[PDB]
Amino acid sequence: ARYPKASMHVVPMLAPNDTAAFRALFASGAVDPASVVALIAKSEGSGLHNDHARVFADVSLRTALAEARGCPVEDLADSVTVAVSGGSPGVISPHVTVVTQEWVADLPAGLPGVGLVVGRGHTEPILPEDIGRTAQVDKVADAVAAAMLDAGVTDPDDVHLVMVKGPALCWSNDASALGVAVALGEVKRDLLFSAVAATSSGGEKRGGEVLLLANSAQSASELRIGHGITRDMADTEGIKTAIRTAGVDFDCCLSPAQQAQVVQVFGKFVLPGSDVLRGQHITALDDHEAHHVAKAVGGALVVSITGQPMSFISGGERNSGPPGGNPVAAVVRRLPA
Template identity: 35%
Template sequence: MPTPRRAALHRVPMRHPGDTAAIEHLITTGRLDPSGIVAILGKTEGNGCVNDFTRAYAVQSLTLMLARHMGVEAAARVALVMSGGTEGGLSPHFLVFTVEAGDAPNPAGALAIGTGFTRDFAPEEIGRPAQAEAVATAVHQAMEAAAITEVHYVQVKCPLLTTERIATAGASVATEDTYASMGLSRGASALGVALALGEVDAVLPEDIGRNWKRFSAVASASAGVELERCEVIVLGNSTAWSGDLAIAHAVMQDAIDLPAVHRAMRLAGLPAEDGQLAPAAAERLVAVLAKAEPSSTGRIRGQRHIMWDDSDINATRHARALVGGVIAGAVGRTDIFVSGGAEHQGPDGGGPVAVIARRALPV
């Protein structure tokens, strides 16, 4: 029988997108074994759009830091997912996921982590079914390697189109609008997750970026200029893993669906009430991950919003600030991972929200 694995998660602040000092401090003080790092998620303070180089800056800094502590080849196997945009009160931070040898498996199930990578995509494949199918394969591989059968959150970092990439395409591309390519790439990735998990039976070209009735309830995709492949992180619970961490999720039906946030907290074992999480329970909260997207109808529960009509501030930036405020009010902290652009990631105007928490000790 294989040795049980144990997942751990460290949440650390960043002073700027290239600041890896908090992670290095964990390593040098012996609290973090770099050989066990499998993925790092980061919320950086850029604009989250095509020219948000805070993502690439953070990836470069993390890659160099990891190479110093674990070697170049091992560092290349760590999934690095940077999500730009900390509008409103959101706090820039890193989430460092590690896997180590565990003890007896938890019969109730414990947090399990699987990672996977697709091949590099040709420009003409981005935002199209070929990308979705490759993501589905990577999700299956990650689930199998980690013995995950109960999936609660799948994070995908995906590429986008730039004018330079479009110029090198061997065929027509999905769009020549570089910003629109972010949404198509996120959408194709999310539908790839849905395909892997049986939420859809196929991904058609006309679905991507158009048919909002087709979505995944657990997918989170973020597009960036810093890569040409997709990097996949599957988070779930598994009875083959040990430890006291668990993950649960719910689906926000719109941007102000506070009850869904409370539901995810309760499913993760936190005694969430109608108000803010109590301090004692907040100590067991490890991470919150969510998607944010302005509804395509221009309305939230019948009331008009102007997120799509603001020519000064991108719509996804509005959405991150709004959803971030709703979740922060529920959990009592602002270092939460809220990613904008939720095409096919939850229903139109809504999105998945996942909570990772430590189980309560028996009384």
């Protein structure tokens, strides 16, 4: 009886505290700041645990949004997911993806297929003895289930991206990933990966946060999401599969029109599980800058396909999806008849 309508606006930042274009989104009446349910950003910086520019972007974005909304900055505590991934090597352009969602009473006619819907969950507080073990895995599975129900989705095959923010003291990102796999029926509780989990951890935040992007037959969005799996460090097929299953029909190269159909890409490039690529030795696990190089490579791959530097390229943590497999999701336009 209510149908979700999700939207995405990608706006550049020239520094972690640059909220000019972000603020102009609202001031022009283009976007209603009350409709915003998530901010997903790439900031310049190192991307390591002590990357303070990342926190500077987080704090800056929250303040700009709270002003646009006319509330104090601590309302947005549980009403909006703010996710800043630090480290923007090479072709990656820092930016913020503004995700909005309202619900409308009538489902428009002539929307082909399924459409994007967003769900949000919160974990019970996670304690440093949980971090890494069963107790964390279950508090995250609950929140994934809660975000699914918030998005009105029951079929896990319709879920294409699950971002989890947990606390830190690898472990957190490993236990959180499993929680998603359990909640999606990818792995039975009793007992190993999730194809669509993109995990983060940091700060002293204790309540975990789940942001879930799926599709629904009852969606009013003019967008659709799909995913793929990057099979090794040089593979573009995962990216291409995410774009294709999101609804672009192409063989191997996108036309300029098809490229512009792609609204955002969310790719996590964790380091590979071995140092052998296509039968040869690579340095990517020995490199002191492995974390920065992983994202430099991922960005090169995604941007070479979409021609859009404002892509969400995260990752660079050491491995433990499938062996040496990385998730990537793509959000693509879905237009009426």
